[PDB]
């Protein structure tokens, strides 16, 4: 997983160097920013049932054609597997808020997605519709604090940019 830790000690390992002042100095920011980026972690972890529910129907409200026969969400079990994917992506965003980098996203949701979504006819626009609907519904003093909202939206946007 790419984080603040695993970046600076692989740059040191590739050069064969001991951890210098720069290495130690990079982890000092992992002390300051982790008060903000971890506050969104339990906020998403405790209320993760009202966000998948509110994103999944917004995806089908933007694209009502998916429930037609021959399409991706034609029957009930396909919609059940569709809500499971938004739950998976919100779990990976919850993980990335905890590591402090885009490690778990890039390993478990991003790498190889552009092959399986084209092979199984899953439209990526309907995937980014739910993430964008989660993105604009962030009441910055009500959902979380200000910097926790910044850290949450910066990981939502990253998944949006990577899926498109």
């Amino acid at each position: 997983m790419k984080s603040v830790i695993t970046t600076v000690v692989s740059a040191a390992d590739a050069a064969g160097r001991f951890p210098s002042n720069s290495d130690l100095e990079s982890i000092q920011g992992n002390i300051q920013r982790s008060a903000a980026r971890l506050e969104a972690a339990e906020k998403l972890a405790g209320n993760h049932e009202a966000v998948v529910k509110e994103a999944g129907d917004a995806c089908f409200a933007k694209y009502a054609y998916l429930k037609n026969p021959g399409e991706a969400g034609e029957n009930q079990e396909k919609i059940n597997k569709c809500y499971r994917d938004v739950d998976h992506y919100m779990r990976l965003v919850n993980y990335c808020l905890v590591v402090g980098g885009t490690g778990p996203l890039d390993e478990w949701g991003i790498a190889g997605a552009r092959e399986v979504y084209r092979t199984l006819n899953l439209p990526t626009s309907a995937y980014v519709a739910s993430i964008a609907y989660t993105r604009d519904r962030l009441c910055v003093p009500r959902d979380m604090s200000a910097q926790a909202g910044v850290e949450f939206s910066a990981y939502l946007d990253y998944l949006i940019n990577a899926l498109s």
């Binding site: 997983m1 790419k2 692989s10 590739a14 064969g16 490690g103 890039d106 390993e107 790498a111 552009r114």
Partner: protein
Amino acid sequence: KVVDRLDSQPSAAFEQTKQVYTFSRYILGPHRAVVAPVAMDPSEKEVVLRAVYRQVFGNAYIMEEERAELRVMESQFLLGELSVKELVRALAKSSTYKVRFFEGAVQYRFIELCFKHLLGRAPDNHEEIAVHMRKYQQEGYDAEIDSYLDAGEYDNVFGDDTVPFLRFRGVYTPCDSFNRQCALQGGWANSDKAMGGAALSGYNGSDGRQMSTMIGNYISGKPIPYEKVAADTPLKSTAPNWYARPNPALAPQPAYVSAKEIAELRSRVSKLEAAWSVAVKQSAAAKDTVETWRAAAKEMAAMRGISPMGEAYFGGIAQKVDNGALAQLGNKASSYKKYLYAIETDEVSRLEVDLEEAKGQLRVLEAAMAKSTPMTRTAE
């Protein structure tokens, strides 16, 4: 003996990197060794694969439609069966390497390209080019690639697990080979499809002639002009980014140059070299005024030398200082700092700066004085 062994020799058991690589241009830019560790995350396998595709194809875009070719042979490396050298052997014998670098190329271009891809080096002399041409013409492309990899020079330098990289050896036998290496890799924003002309000549950019320059430089020993080594180069992608007294980076050539400014500059440089060659002889002989008296003043200063603290009362008053290696002889903090302004204070060194910069201004003007007929001029 400042350099013990070269990099063509296998690495010693006492050093982590080669001794030549510690004070060459190796420590500066991204042309370094990327070693695959012995157990790898599927994260950090892609760090190796991206460096391989950056190196073996030599800066190619490679859309993922052109990657579904190589999804078989990357999988033997992702499992951990293929080493890095067998991965570049499998990648060179694939078809996308062939259609890019073999299938529209003159033989000189293909040989000088796989010298740059499979090894970190330019073609050294003509005799090593001819042996690879005769290796291809009787045995084919497949044995031609193994002629590069399966010899002495690959395994002593890269081993089986470092990816190839542009080698900044520091010790060049044929000399020009450094200039050919710097003119073969054209800096960070170049490729071989662009430098080989395989896109302008091609039809809708595909089916291009992979033509080559500098084949007159291989045959006759006629070395590379300086503009392809100073303008677009790995020297400035792997630059030290410091303050040089002659700046080695060339200025872009000016439009609307005249012969009058060239004549006055060529007179200036001829005055400056004549002034330098006579200022040389006076230096280190009449360099100092207190130099004849240096031998005289030492015996006057040798009196009243005492060890402990407090001496030289000079009448009734007690205070004194002395006792210091640099101070025992009257020197201050400004006595060692006079070497740090010598560029603009030494009478000899001023001429040497202004000689080199008048030369550097001169050299670009006759590059601009190669164009004559539909060439409008100004009045400065």
